[PDB]
Design a protein around this nucleic acid. Sequence first.
DNA 1: AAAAAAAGAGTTGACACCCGGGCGAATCCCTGCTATAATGGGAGCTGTCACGGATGC
Length: 49
Amino acid sequence: DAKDIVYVRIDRRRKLPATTFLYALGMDGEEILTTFYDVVPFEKRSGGW
DNA sequence: AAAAAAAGAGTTGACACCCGGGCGAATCCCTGCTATAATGGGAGCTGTCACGGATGC
């Protein structure tokens, strides 16, 4: 989309966000984010950063 | 110089017949009635644009 939003449409139907189709499958919750973006650890407010 | 008849008309009975209207008979169309248990549906694009307009917050 022009707004940088992924839109999925099945059989040229009304456009809806791909997050709905992803949640329809087994992958739910933060599993869709853990598989797309990597996570980096950080300290729990130590000296400085 | 005269004077009556095959056609031309006109009918008068004498069949030949040809669809019409009935009498039949033979046969079509409608309608309903069947009693174990039946319980939500199958394609179709999706390889043209572009314009010109109609809804919505």
